[PDB]
């Protein structure tokens with residue numbers, strides 16, 4: 315209900331997610347940036363029984379950057395929380411890992427942050 | 435074949451995963467540490483068509499820290515790569531996000547690293 | 555000139571810095587949040603000869619959370635870049651490490667992000 | 675006494691540091707890897723009054739990747755803890771930020787981990 319829907323980051327990337335009663339996140343991620351083109355499968359987990367003291371709902375998901383058209387040989391994971399209300403928000407930090415040789419493995423993992431809203 | 439199996443981190447946590455032909459990771463995570471007890475659902479993605487130049491296979495997965503017995507109101511995401519061979523390895527960095535109030539949201543996200551092997 | 559001055563994060567924390575000709579950052583950090591009170595020493599480094607292609611100036615600094623009044627037994631490091639102009643900005647990610655036992659060392663390091671401006 | 679000395683990471687990089695009575699870290703970093711050559715200035719902070727319950731000493735430092743010979747237009751920060759004894763150790767996580775355009779700013783920050791020992 316809260317987490318199910320279409321979400322938009324600050325850089326124009328679309329996250330279309332379903333929050334299953336079990337705790338499953340399934341969907342598609344469309345990335346406006348990077349070595350990516352078009353639509354990618356998303357899987358993840360959320361807290362299906364969150365705290366009743368105004369705290370956010372912990373969640374996370376993974377996109378492997380491989381569809382029928384492109385393969386970036388990389389995966390992003392987002393770790394975050396859903397903050398429900400009028401101005402509904404998913405505040406995340408992410409890790410992007412690239413497939414490297416053991417000599418390049420030190421420089422394999424980019425870190426960042428994304429804020430997602432339900433407003434295009 | 436490579437990624438499918440039972441994996442062990444440096445702190446004694448068990449990761450039992452199946453790597454589906456589509457790019458799906460499904461399994462269970464048993465955590466030896468933290469505010470956790472017993473067995474938790476794992477979902478993730480991997481690069482189902484990796485590079486043929488000695489590079490690792492990018493992957494990622496999520497555990498929401500909620501089963502039938504416990505709820506820690508938190509989720510970990512691991513971002514990493516599978517390095518195949520005799521001494522097969524998953525080198526990861528992780529983000530653990532806790533469900534917080536907006537006043538506590540600065541301190542919501544722990545970062546770390548795990549190395550997983552197929553040797554108990 | 556650019557980096558020298560008083561800076562304000564999104565959570566109301568004051569960063570007063572001098573950018574030395576050698577590449578030295580020296581100053582004080584006043585933290586509006588956490589287990590902190592009042593004014594703490596800052597040391598860091600910046601790129602004293604940045605690129606002339608509209609790119610930001612790489613920098614970083616450390617605060618150990620210990621003055622004459624408090625000791626939180628912790629240190630934050632910020633890694634970022636100075637973006638000069640009319641709306642001058644320091645975009646950072648940070649690591650906060652706490653002094654722990656080896657059993658608690660997995661949960662020692664919080665990660666986040668701060669944006670600093672010259673507007674109070 | 676504990677933190678003052680020559681330190682070696684897992685990838686063969688030398689950290690030569692002095693731990694001042696005030697809490698100041700000063701030194702040189704010699705990087706065995708990356709777009710770097712030779713010797714770079716290090717500044718940082720440590721907890722000069724740590725806890726007497728077997729807990730590590732929180733510290734941090736910054737290297738801007740610029741000397742008289744090279745400029746990588748980047749800075750690394752390490753956040754960590756000193757674990758004293760027979761097998762003395764500095765366990766860190768790091769952020770490497772590169773000077774980028776605002777279009778490339780999402781991919782500006784690499785994350786990793788280093789363990790330093792006093793054994794070459």
Ligand SMILES: O=C(O)CCCC[C@@H]1SC[C@@H]2NC(=O)N[C@@H]21
Nearest residue numbers: 327345348349350379386388390
């Ligand atoms: O460049 C790549 O290796 C593949 C595309 C990565 C897209 C990045 S992942 C973090 C951030 N979130 C997005 O909306 N896309 C970028």
Ligand SMILES: O=C(O)CCCC[C@@H]1SC[C@@H]2NC(=O)N[C@@H]21
Nearest residue numbers: 447465468469470499506508510
């Ligand atoms: O303490 C909690 O909030 C829930 C348990 C967290 C387990 C952590 S997640 C990162 C690391 N990997 C493990 O094997 N377990 C710990």
Ligand SMILES: O=C(O)CCCC[C@@H]1SC[C@@H]2NC(=O)N[C@@H]21
Nearest residue numbers: 567585588589590619626628630
């Ligand atoms: O709570 C502590 O352990 C000490 C105070 C930490 C202050 C944090 S560090 C990251 C963020 N930046 C700030 O302005 N202060 C908080």
Ligand SMILES: O=C(O)CCCC[C@@H]1SC[C@@H]2NC(=O)N[C@@H]21
Nearest residue numbers: 687705708709710739746748750
């Ligand atoms: O490649 C660059 O941009 C400059 C050199 C970076 C060296 C990296 S920083 C993290 C790690 N620690 C080291 O010993 N060196 C590498």
